[PDB]
Write a protein that binds this ligand. Structure first.
Ligand SMILES: Cc1cc2nc3c(=O)[nH]c(=O)nc-3n(C[C@H](O)[C@H](O)[C@H](O)COP(=O)(O)OP(=O)(O)OC[C@H]3O[C@@H](n4cnc5c(N)ncnc54)[C@H](O)[C@@H]3O)c2cc1C
Length: 241
């Protein structure tokens, strides 16, 4: 199933983020439970959206149940990418079709404390995880951004300490996650980020800190220097280990 949509709005929210709103009755069957699900943007091989198919995976940042709109937050990154190129050039009134939505493993709610980690590709998904936590949840959410102006107001339980880390030659998600004071056994982890940060933090959480598999979701959302079509293959290679 593919759903045709129209660009209803496009806003540069911060240096690294373009928020695009897509609208159409083809998604009127969505509900707010689809926030945080992933969808696939559909392109032809020539990079257009008028439909071999090239797909790109994005998160539903929000769903408006009044007028059938989703917001998608595109990292303004820069081989040229299909989705980012489309997002920076598209005009209100343009069209694109999507596939999905699908779901991924979530943060285990049975943790006694919670450790969430994200880079910019994963902020919409992280926000959905924060909204699902009970209001008394405790722990950390560590988020890597490329520019200080990329910080967002995120709704979170009061005792989830949110920290924003601006990437530079000495500052990054992996280092900042490892630096947090470990709060002991029974933690539940959710982490979505770039492939090599994922690998380092998977070793930290699973081996060094002994988190069992059902108390951690850790996933790569992209690999620097590789397009999504290669990244999906790299995931299969990484799974063989
Ligand atoms: C479940 C899931 C949900 C996701 N949700 C989102 C989301 O809501 N928003 C979002 O922005 N991304 C999200 N991503 C990541 C997104 O799929 C990738 O960033 C994708 O590569 C972007 O496609 P593209 O066509 O622009 O670039 P591609 O054609 O895939 O890649 C072209 C080049 O750009 C590089 N590149 C790709 N992404 C980035 C980046 N973020 N920073 C720097 N360089 C990059 C690649 O490494 C490659 O060298 C999600 C990924 C997954 C698996």
């Amino acid at each position: 199933s593919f759903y045709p949509l129209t660009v209803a709005d496009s806003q540069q929210i911060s240096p690294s983020l373009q928020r695009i709103t897509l609208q159409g009755d083809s998604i009127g069957h969505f509900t707010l439970e689809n926030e945080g699900d992933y969808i696939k943007l559909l392109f032809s091989e020539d990079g257009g959206t008028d439909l071999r198919q090239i797909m790109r995976t994005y998160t539903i940042r929000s769903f408006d149940a009044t007028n059938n709109r989703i917001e998608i937050d595109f990292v303004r990154h820069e081989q040229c990418g299909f989705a980012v190129r489309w997002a920076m050039h598209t005009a209100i009134g343009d069209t694109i079709s999507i596939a999905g939505p699908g779901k991924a493993q979530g943060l285990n709610p049975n943790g006694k404390w919670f450790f969430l980690a994200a880079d910019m590709t994963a902020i919409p998904a992280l926000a959905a995880q924060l909204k699902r936590l009970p209001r008394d949840a405790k722990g950390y959410a560590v988020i890597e951004i490329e520019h200080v102006d990329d910080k967002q107001a995120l709704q979170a339980p009061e005792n989830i300490e949110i920290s924003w880390v601006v990437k530079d030659s000495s500052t990054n998600l992996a280092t900042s996650v490892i630096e947090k004071n470990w709060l002991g056994e029974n933690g539940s982890v959710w982490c979505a980020c770039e492939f090599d940060t994922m690998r380092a933090l998977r070793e930290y959480f699973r081996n060094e800190k002994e988190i069992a598999k059902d108390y951690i979701y850790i996933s790569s959302y992209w690999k620097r220097g590789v397009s999504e079509d290669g990244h999906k293959q790299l995931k299969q290679t990484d799974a063989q280990t």
